[PDB]
């Protein structure tokens, strides 16, 4: 935080991550309004990563309206995190549980900046964009996104049984560069398994990318 020297701001400005699982090779991120894989350890990774903040800080999760509707009521808002829901019909309100119902990523970022990136008298550490496909494909083009946390998902059943995806991440690889595993662990603040994790007909690898 602040020091007697007067040289440091109270907190660093929060990094923005887009966290997503994408099917190889064509970056499929949805099928028929859902997702064809259900990976228990990957869902735990999402919980652990989005919840892990440096001491005295909290993280934010930013999601589209349709994804908010698919979180079970008893688990909303996602505990231990600033929840932001995007809908163009929202009225830019912060409700009785501290949930931000905002009309655009621009509007919520403007508000957070006005508040010195603080919430419930906690500074923000990381802001995670958590989906769904429409919000991912809008915000992956936003210059404020600092990194991608991509779970690379591989189908390892028979070729004919691979799920047919119908929504894909608008990810231009020329704009991004994969980092080594130590950088991923240092960013997320956790010990993360390296390599291909196995569950059923899928394997999956945790990766991090920054801008080229
Ligand atoms: N691969 C992965 O890791 C993940 C994939 N998914 C997949 O995502 C899919 C669902 O995603 P989707 O249906 O696209 O729903 P989203 O969660 O992306 O929410 C879509 C809604 O966001 C609002 N919206 C759209 N553009 C804007 C904007 N510019 N500013 C503000 N609000 C906006 C709209 O509601 P309004 O009209 O009210 O503005 C729209 O209906 C499912 O297939 C799910 O499995 C979800 C999570 C993780």
Author numbering: -9 to 202
Article, verbatim:
Dihydrofolate reductase (DHFR) is a key and essential enzyme in the folate pathway that converts dihydrofolate (DHF) to tetrahydrofolate (THF). This coenzyme is required for a variety of cellular processes, including the synthesis of purine involved in nucleic acid and amino-acid biosynthesis. The active site is located in a cleft formed by α-helix 1, α-helix 2, α-helix 4 and β-sheet 1, similar to CglDHFR and CalDHFR. As classified in E. coli DHFR, CauDHFR could also be designated to have two subdomains: the nucleotide subdomain, in which the NADPH sits, and the substrate-binding subdomain, which is predominantly formed by α-helix 1, α-helix 2 and β-sheet 1.
Crystals of apo and holo CauDHFR have a single protomer in the asymmetric unit, while the ternary complexes CauDHFR–NADPH–PYR and CauDHFR–NADPH–CYG contained two protein molecules which are independent and do not form a quaternary structure, according to the PISA server. In order to obtain the structures of the CauDHFR–NADPH–PYR and CauDHFR–NADPH–CYG ternary complexes, the N-terminal His tag of the protein needed to be removed since analysis of the crystal packing of the CauDHFR–NADPH complex showed that the N-terminus of the adjacent symmetric protomer extends into the substrate-binding site, blocking ligand access. The NADPH binding site is located in a very positively charged cleft between α-helix 2 and α-helix 4, in which the cofactor is involved in an extensive number of hydrogen-bonding interactions. The diphosphate groups interact with both α-helix 2 and α-helix 4, specifically with Gly54, Thr57, Gly122, Ser123 and Gln124. The adenine group interacts with Leu76, Ser77, Arg78 and Leu128 between α-helix 3 and α-helix 4, which is the most solvent-exposed moiety of NADPH. The ribose ring makes interactions with Ile19, Gly23 and Ser24 from the substrate-binding domain, which is the most neutral region of the cofactor-binding site. The nicotinamide moiety is buried in the active site of the enzyme, interacting with Ala11, Ile19, Leu25 and Tyr126, extending further towards the substrate-binding subdomain. The substrate-binding regions of apo and holo CauDHFR are largely similar, with the addition of NADPH not making a substantial difference to most residue orientations. The main difference observed is movement of Leu25, with a change of 5 Å between the isopropyl functional groups.
